[PDB]
């Protein structure tokens, strides 16, 4: 039975920094103030925001880290993320250093339902070269998905209101989680975005501290000082050529609240990286976004890889994780060499996007994807992209970036202003 479903959207953007999370919360507070003064705020339903929001990224050592951790239930985080789910009766998501009762550290997201409980809590499964500055630890559980009760969000195709409660498989996917493992893997195993498609989620909810390319990242230039210290020197003109002071910009808000303005569809180009016109989307990341999705994204050479069976190994021979993750490291561990059957789980498995039964297996399907990216910079070096955005997968049936027209961009931030945007969100779910 075809469900329709409209879903309100809230995505926060921020620019936190190490040592103020006071003043983080007091403009995120100032934010959500201004949001509900805008002239189409409506209430939304779920909150997203940005890794790692209140306290800052670039954590250089565990002593540093420390005293911004919390426990799941715990701290700073929790109890904004609980007022927050209060005040506006919804589902708040917000990314947060953890410890856990083991002196265990990772880097977390946690969800609070509109009673203010907490109803999940997700561990950062693919790590970046910053986290293991901390001792920071793979998700054991590797890539969860979790159930979400919406109220009044749903209907049946004939009726004329949203009176019905519907509960969405939700899966969230912290930055790096998007990448290829470690960036070693190939390319083309797209192994959240796989995951999700093979666990028919339908609600991608992504909090990201994820880079700008003008950001230094070369490693013989990060350990020789005289080489940083040049590049450095090209970050702070780039900064200060756009009036901003080094850290990036802080308190002057950017409200997309309620509008239906959508992202204009554009190709990578060499000035789509550029760090300019703060209150525009990175370009360049929002479609290296959407090919990091290419499952849910319709493509024509599918129909013959299906054909010839092309990729029927690949599906059979992928495991749930990479096999040197944390995953199998305890707890977890050739079906046509074998008297053991087809399970339901096998059929379900998709590689590049195709199963063993369709050669696309999101076709005529639904889903949500909404990612919540900070802004700012760090250490002189780092260059955070913004450009948090929303976006719908409407599997209907090309090109690899946001020209693809299987994905709806709904709306996205600038690559450099703190803020917010809003948006109602239509589609449908099978139940």
Known sequence: TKLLVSLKVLVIQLNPQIGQVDQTIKRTWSILDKVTKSATYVKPDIILFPE??????????????????????????????????????????????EEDDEQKLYNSALVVNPQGGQIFNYRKTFLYDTEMNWDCEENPEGFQTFPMDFSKCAKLSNEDSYNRDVTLKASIGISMDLSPYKFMAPFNHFEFSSFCVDNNVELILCPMAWLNSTSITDKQTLHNNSLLEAAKNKIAFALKEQGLPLAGSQGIYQLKIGDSQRTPRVPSDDSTSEYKDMDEPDMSNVNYWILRFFPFLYFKLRINWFKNSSLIESILGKTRMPLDHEYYKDGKHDLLDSEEVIKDTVLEKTFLGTSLGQPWKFQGKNAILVLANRCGTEDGTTIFAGSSGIYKFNGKKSSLDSLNESVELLGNLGKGLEGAILREVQFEVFR
């Open 52 to 97: 790692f929001a209140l306290t800052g990224y670039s954590f250089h050592a565990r002593k540093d880290i420390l005293p911004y951790v919390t426990k799941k239930d715990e701290g700073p985080s929790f109890e904004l993320a609980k007022s927050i789910s209060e005040k506006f009766q919804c589902y708040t998501i917000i990314g947060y250093p």
